[PDB]
Design a protein around this ligand. Structure first.
Ligand code: HEM
Ligand code: HEM
Ligand SMILES: C[C@@H](O)[C@@H](O)[C@H]1CNc2nc(N)[nH]c(=O)c2N1
Ligand SMILES: C[C@@H](O)[C@@H](O)[C@H]1CNc2nc(N)[nH]c(=O)c2N1
Ligand SMILES: C[As](C)(=O)[O-]
Ligand SMILES: C[As](C)(=O)[O-]
Ligand SMILES: [Zn+2]
Lengths: 416, 414
């Protein structure tokens, strides 16, 4: 048969071939020898700080490829406007060492990056993304205004809208624009004397960083952290988000009346802010993006991970389950009710949310659309299948091919 | 080159140096990862009508023998050298060789140990190895299989076992067990195109009737075995009801569950895989242990392409099947897995839940890190089909690679 990866769906018995991977110009962790596909941060993509300007020729080949992708998307490949834009990018790189993107090219690339993200199960929405251009931003203070506008627009009082704000690209001989926090909204994690943590253990370091920069800490489990925004060559400045902008949802359960008394809650807007947006060789170190939550992100990972809120045991005790033995499946029962509480509470509060069943079904539709449109879809199986009820969703039975396509969202080293 | 493996629940880190011993390649490449694929494109094991290359075989043989003598700490000794000369002498004159029972036992255990997809490898050292290499007929195969089943079942106190039939030989048909498992429920494709019984077994069920078996009309009809001796049509052998222990499914609190008439067998015995030791291939080597509850409760009973009983249970539980957000599927699934565990514990039949199993697997990884400097594992298979992140293995990065001895997939005989 064909010379491309054969991908099978074991539920429906259907077969497809991924021809899109052929266009992957970057390598990943795997080798014929061993499969390092489960590693969360394998050292390949890793956009480690490469100070001194990049090879003029390497940037070029990357820029040429992107422009071609752009002209193809508009069905004008090989046209006069295409060849001229190519001549322009080269001329620019030849005299300055870098180049700049036109407005429409940025919008296109931002959407492609999302479209290309192997770990995102919400890609059926890729074509619907509000792209805020913020490449004129010249201060940490201005960064704060743009971000507040982003949160306001994206939150949209509960009827969430996907969006991304793009700050100035990395420049030769100039510091990067950086948002120190991993997400625009994060709960503080306070390191106690007795070794434990109050709040979210995941945010311990950033919480301690805000303190070293002048933040006066609180002492709750759900304290919203301030932002540490960094303009070029300047130390990060602290900014506190107006409570009214940060929409939160108190969690309650549809039938277990005591669940509300737990005082649990979570914020409505999931906005990643520490990832790097790469387009045609240009690197956007600060380009926060946000969509809406898939219920399991909150109910299973954030609230039940042993290294996060770890509320499984407490909730099980309230449901009066036998937590002394594994065969009682007490962990499973509690997790289900907690995830149900998240869904119930968001719907009640009229805030956008999607359960793992709906999400995965929609992702299958996305795979089908992309099979026709591009001959494949890069996907990270371990990240696409939900943390609970895995084989109960359609994606579990779908084989997937993972590879890196550019434009893309990449991990980058912490500024500190 | 040495994978830096990390555990995200504890923050601990280790380096896998064992993968360097891997001489066999996987499907992955630096350009794209295909680890989520179940069966290879061709990594299989092409035909064996001719003798395998002497240099190739001799190399795998010497390596395996080196392995065995390290295991008994007699490496470099005289016996070790005389065994190497024996193997080299035999291969040079016949193009192949044979293993000693002790070596075979060692090889069978290492194969289990090296199985990337097995979560119960903590039990790898406890395996009853039955040497069935002195088998010359389908009928003999059957008797051997019946003894394996009797031994392994052990009145409900399951014991891990493997029976090894004659190795493959150049230019001669293979000994084969056509069934994928020793115990499988029939899949009768009823007119409508739908299926009564286990849909996964529609093909083998067809082949059995085609070879004379008189089918039934139930959802849990135990199939007969199609045993095949070299270059001979497979024969039909019905398994004695007494040998095939089964567990009636009922729920600890929901009284109507038993009414569903659900049931499942006690012994999970894979019989379609190939066992490779030092270059020798054993096309018929059925092995078995005991079930992990999710294999039955989640996959076999709830997979959409299997018994797919999720909705039925939900309707009986009186849940909101109208929408996905009511999490009716997750709810019914948990009760079904609870029923399986309850039932098996009630019938005094060995079983392990996914929580206990993964904790043990974590320990195994630990034991292996100190013993061999690593442990090949396939994350997608190790992590349970439900409550993934609720178990320790989900948060553990894993490295996947091929070590030999090894259990491999092989073409269907027909
Ligand atoms: C519209 C709603 C969306 C949903 C429901 C969704 C859902 C998901 C989920 C479940 C994850 C996994 C989170 C984790 O386990 O860490 C994820 C990862 C990701 N998503 Fe989406 N997504 C959506 C929108 C977005 C948007 C708007 C972008 C970008 C423009 C995006 C980019 C990504 C990327 C790059 C990752 C990988 C992050 C990482 O590697 O940690 N997603 N998404
Ligand atoms: C002691 C009890 C054992 C338990 C609890 C256990 C559990 C498991 C589980 C849950 C799987 C996944 C099966 C699937 O999803 O289809 C598996 C796969 C596997 N196990 Fe074990 N196992 C045990 C004993 C054995 C034994 C005795 C052997 C061999 C001597 C073995 C060899 C393997 C192999 C080769 C696979 C992969 C099979 C395939 O690719 O389909 N296991 N085991
Ligand atoms: C070990 C590593 O593959 C595991 O921790 C991954 C697996 N799935 C997964 N999936 C999502 N969506 N998010 C995650 O953080 C992870 N973690
Ligand atoms: C698509 C394919 O990788 C998926 O169906 C795999 C994943 N995990 C898994 N895990 C186990 N234990 N058994 C299986 O059959 C599978 N199937
Ligand atoms: C808090 As409840 C028992
Ligand atoms: C069996 As109930 C409805
Ligand atoms: Zn891989």
């Amino acid at each position: 048969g064909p010379k491309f990866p054969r991908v099978k769906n074991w539920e429906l018995g259907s077969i497809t071939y991924d021809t899109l991977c052929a266009q992957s110009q970057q390598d990943g962790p795997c080798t014929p020898r061993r499969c390092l596909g489960s590693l969360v941060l394998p050292r390949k993509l890793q956009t480690r700080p490469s100070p001194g300007p990049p090879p003029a020729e390497q940037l070029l080949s990357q820029a040429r490829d992107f422009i071609n992708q752009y002209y193809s998307s508009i069905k004008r490949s090989g046209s006069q406007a295409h060849e001229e834009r190519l001549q322009e990018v080269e001329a620019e790189v030849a005299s300055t060492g870098t180049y700049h993107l036109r407005e429409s090219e940025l919008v296109f690339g931002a959407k492609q990056a999302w479209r290309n993200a192997p770990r995102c199960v919400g890609r059926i929405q890729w074509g619907k993304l509000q792209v805020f251009d913020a490449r004129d931003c010249s201060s940490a203070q201005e960064m704060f205004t743009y971000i507040c506008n982003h949160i306001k627009y994206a939150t949209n009082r509960g009827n969430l809208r996907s969006a991304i704000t793009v700050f100035p690209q990395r420049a030769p001989g100039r510091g990067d624009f950086r948002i120190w926090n991993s997400q625009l909204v994060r709960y503080a994690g306070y390191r106690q004397q007795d070794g434990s943590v109050r709040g979210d253990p995941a945010n311990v370091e950033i919480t301690e960083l805000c303190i070293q920069h002048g933040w006066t800490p609180g002492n709750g489990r759900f304290d919203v952290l301030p932002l540490l925004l960094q303009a070029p060559d300047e130390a990060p400045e602290l900014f506190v988000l107006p409570p009214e902008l940060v929409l939160e949802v108190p969690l309650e359960h549809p039938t277990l009346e005591w669940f509300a008394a737990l005082g649990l809650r979570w914020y409505a807007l999931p906005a990643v802010s520490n990832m790097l947006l790469e387009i045609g060789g240009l690197e956007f170190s600060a380009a926060p993006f946000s969509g809406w939550y898939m219920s399991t992100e909150i109910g299973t990972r954030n609230l039940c991970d042993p290294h996060r809120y770890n509320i499984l045991e407490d909730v099980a005790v309230c449901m009066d389950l036998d937590t002394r033995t594994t065969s009682s499946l007490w962990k499973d029962k509690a997790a289900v009710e907690i995830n149900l509480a998240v869904l119930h509470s968001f719907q009640l509060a009229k805030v956008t949310i999607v359960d793992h069943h709906a999400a995965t079904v929609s992702f299958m539709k996305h795979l089908d659309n992309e099979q026709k449109a591009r001959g494949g879809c890069p996907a990270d199986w371990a990240w696409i299948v939900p943390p609970i009820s895995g084989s109960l969703t359609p994606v579990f039975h779908q084989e997937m091919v993972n590879y890196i396509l550019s434009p893309a969202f990449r991990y980058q080293p912490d500024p500190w």
